[PDB]
């Protein structure tokens, strides 16, 4: 299902398995995709953190504070865990439910926090990401870029 | 999907 996920998207995917590597961890949990996130820093999801009011730099050292570092060098290619594979999941869930046939980062964001359980729902949640909070922001940004923040996978 | 980078 990647072929249908932006640019942004992509790329979050991508900087999440160094978030992950740069800490010593063999394994890319819902944590490193935040992480990910926020390194990405400028599609939907960012910007709809920044427009309820929460830093993403605030979010990213909360995550650093919980999860610590590793021993041991991971190489090659790093796994998902099974709470990020559910993250996926339930992007791509978040994303159908909306009316959406791509999935962006907003769509990512929302799959963290309806995982509920990993280290990002929680970072999260704490600081007022509710879900339903959340998606309300999403419509609205998307609204207000008009289709001019996130290009989709090889998109007119 | 739904394993790796880009998998």
Same mark, same amino acid.
């Given at each position: ?12 995917? %991508? ?19 935040? *992480?990910? *996130? ?51 999941? *339930?992007? *791509? ?31 999260? %949640? ?31 | ?7």
């Amino acid at each position: 299902m990647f072929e249908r996920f932006t640019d942004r998207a992509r790329r979050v995917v %991508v900087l999440a398995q160094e978030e992950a590597r740069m800490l010593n961890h063999n394994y890319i949990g819902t944590e490193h995709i935040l *992480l990910g *996130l926020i390194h990405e820093g400028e599609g939907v999801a960012a910007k709809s953190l920044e427009s309820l009011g929460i830093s993403l730099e605030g979010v990213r050292s909360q995550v650093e504070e919980i999860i610590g570092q590793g021993q041991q060098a991971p190489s090659g290619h790093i796994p998902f865990t099974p709470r990020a594979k559910k993250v996926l999941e *339930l992007s *791509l869930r978040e994303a159908l439910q909306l009316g959406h046939n791509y999935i962006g980062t907003e769509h990512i964001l929302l799959g963290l926090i309806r995982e509920g359980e990993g280290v990002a729902a929680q970072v999260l %949640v704490k600081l007022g990401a509710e879900l339903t909070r959340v998606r309300q922001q999403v419509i609205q940004l998307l609204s207000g870029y008009q289709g001019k923040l996130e290009h989709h996978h090889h998109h007119h | 999907w739904x394993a790796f980078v880009l998998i």
